[PDB]
């Protein structure tokens, strides 16, 4: 079904974009030895 393909595509792209933009959100700073 095309609708199932659309839903799976948008779910996959949603989680991949969550991963990608999350690692771009200053990830090396999120560590306990952060210099204030």
């Amino acid at each position: 079904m095309f609708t199932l393909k659309i839903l799976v595509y948008t779910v996959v792209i949603f989680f991949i974009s969550l991963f990608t933009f999350g690692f771009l959100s200053s990830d090396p700073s999120r560590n306990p030895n952060r210099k204030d």
Partner: protein, 44 residues
């Protein structure tokens, strides 16, 4: 939808605008001399 690229473009836009809103109040304009950037402007 039809060509399957709008699903790609549309979703990374929506999360992209959320990321851009977070990026707007980041004072990252000045360049640092370090192994990693420890500057993260947490509003709250």
């Amino acid at each position: 939808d039809d060509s399957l690229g709008f699903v790609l473009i549309g979703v990374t836009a929506v999360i992209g605008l959320a990321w851009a809103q977070w990026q707007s109040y980041q004072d990252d304009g000045d360049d640092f001399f370090d192994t990693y950037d420890s500057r993260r402007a947490a509003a709250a």
